[PDB]
Amino acid sequence: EDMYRAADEIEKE
Amino acid sequence: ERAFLVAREELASALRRDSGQAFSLEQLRPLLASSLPLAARYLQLDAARLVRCNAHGEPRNYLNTLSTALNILEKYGRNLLSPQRPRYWRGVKFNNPVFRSTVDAVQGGRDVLRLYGYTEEQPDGLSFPEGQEEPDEHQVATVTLEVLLLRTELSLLLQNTHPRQQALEQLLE
Lengths: 13, 173
Ligand SMILES: [Cl-]
Known about the structure:
The complex is a heterodimer. Chain A is an all-alpha fold. Chain A has one helix at residues 7-11. Chain A is 38% helix and 0% strand. The longest helix of chain A is centred in the last third of the chain and has 5 residues, at 7-11. Chain B has one domain: Methane Monooxygenase Hydroxylase, Chain G, domain 1, CATH 1.20.58. In chain B, a hairpin with a 2-residue loop joins β2 (120-122) and β3 (125-127). Chain B is globular and about 45 Å long. The termini of chain B are far apart. The interface between A and B is medium-sized, with 10 and 20 residues. Bound molecules: chloride ion. Chloride ion binds at residues 22-23, 148 of chain B. Chain B: It is found in: Cytoplasm. Chain B: It comes from Homo sapiens (Human).
């Protein structure tokens, strides 16, 4: 999983 | 038996050579079986503060909390060393699910990221300075080595199989 972006920015995708 | 600094240079160079390399206890042993105090064996990673400033509850609990954070911090280091770095590698958000649940649970966790090169601080996270094209490979490899070494020591301490178990337990509050 992504370890860099914020949770919301990951939730946008 | 290899000297401390002999083994250290060897391991750090190997990790820089291959970012996905696994290290055995036999290779790591000269680094952790040394009679030198904890504060002297670690030259980049602030292992002393990590152990001391996270002593909450019983060692069975907080050593595992620290180990969990160190496992992720190691991944952060290997990512920077990999021949193909992952996307968004230049910055780590505080609200990142992985970081928030593992690394940010320990005091000093963010300082490790700073050692990797994430030195610029914004209220939403840490990131490399603008204008710095690449990570300091020698520095990242050294810090990554110390992170996995510390996690190894905590594992041995939890198993009561550390060669310097008796001495290191005195650091446990
Ligand atoms: Cl390893």
